[PDB]
Design a protein around this ligand. Structure first.
Ligand SMILES: [Ca+2]
Ligand SMILES: [Ca+2]
Ligand SMILES: [Ca+2]
Ligand SMILES: [Ca+2]
Lengths: 225, 225
């Protein structure tokens, strides 16, 4: 088996929030279609799979010219992990070697250029994850964590809470748009974060995650320059 | 000198962002007035001081029936620390014993009831800070910090990045609305965070910080039930 670069787009019919989110249109193209177009235009992938339990989602994926894996109910439930869906898609097409990239349709401003830029960071020898990330609005060192009921401790030092942000290490959070992994490592570890993890930095604007009707319009407003 | 409970409201004329922010009206009352009303209605304070360099701000403070400390230019500049303003106000009225609470006008949804609730957490024997805080939208353990150029490390463990949030310690960030300190300790430490710090938890809604015109309207929308 030669190595393959696989993109997996997980899109279930009964999304846990906004109804029918994956097929909602933005600029005349479904969220699903925006992410398929990003995958195709990246030219990074040998195979692009949409994994779904819904008939309308499957028909949309076929109309965009990509492969469909049908997920049974037990893998498309509110308790089913994303990793189990990706593993199932890989098993269905018979790939256990190469790279596998998770592209969630809820990140419609992540483009094919972003995907190519992220892919350029992947190290084929060391094989840690590449994860897209954006800067933290609120610095995570300026927080306290609960240790006992009503008792809290600084994330690191109490003095960090008053430090000028520019004097603190730069901080980033995964934004959900892109997770790139070595396929065999993802199968063995059964997770998306595999050390040593590299970050592909994206802007706040491009990192928008669609959960609400207002996220949809904001994303549309951004697309208009 | 008997102990006094002092509230200090820092309000300079040349705020670093929105122009004339401290006197902008919300529901027919200036931001400054909302915070003065919170201080008065809390009944927590022996003295309420507005520290300012601006004539219009001073006149507003006098119209609400509180004391005014005039800050010279060197203490009302873009580089002047908040702590130096509070220290100057305390020196001006001659208080070095009791408690001192910083109330920023940019937190107009923080009420007198919030202040009283926060004050009830202050420990007069141990004398750590009480700081108002709100829950973190994005969990601070699900972040990576820059260590070298293009190299990042998990805040704590890489496995935290995939942990269900409810399995992680609860996390909070100071929201800027209330800082309560022992006066002598604040003078000695020259900072607002003094161990052991206790948190007064506020909702996201009540924690709104005014920096933009849209923050102003959102805060007004919230005031309407
Ligand atoms: Ca091809
Ligand atoms: Ca520590
Ligand atoms: Ca009185
Ligand atoms: Ca660590």
């Amino acid at each position: 088996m030669e190595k393959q670069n696989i993109a997996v787009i997980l899109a279930r019919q009964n999304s846990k929030g906004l109804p029918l989110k994956n097929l909602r249109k933005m600029n005349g193209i479904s969220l699903l279609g925006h992410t398929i177009n990003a995958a195709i235009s990246s030219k990074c992938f040998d195979r692009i799979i949409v994994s779904t339990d819904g008939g309308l989602i499957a028909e949309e994926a076929k109309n965009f010219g990509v492969e469909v894996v049908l997920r049974p109910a037990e893998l498309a439930s509110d308790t089913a992990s994303s990793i189990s869906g990706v593993i199932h898609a890989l098993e269905t097409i018979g790939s256990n070697s190469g790279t596998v990239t998770l592209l969630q349709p809820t990140s419609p401003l992540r483009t094919g250029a972003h995907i190519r830029e992220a892919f350029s960071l992947f190290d084929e020898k060391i094989k840690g994850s590449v994860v897209s990330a954006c800067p933290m609005e609120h610095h995570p060192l300026k927080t306290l964590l609960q240790i006992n009921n009503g008792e809290y401790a600084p994330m690191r030092h109490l003095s960090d809470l008053e430090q000028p942000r520019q004097q603190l290490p730069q901080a980033f959070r995964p934004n959900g748009a892109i997770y790139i992994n070595d396929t065999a490592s993802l199968i063995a570890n059964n997770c998306f974060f595999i050390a040593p993890t590299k970050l592909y930095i994206m802007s706040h604007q491009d990192s928008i995650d669609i959960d609400t009707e207002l996220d949809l319009q904001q994303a549309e407003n951004i697309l208009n320059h």
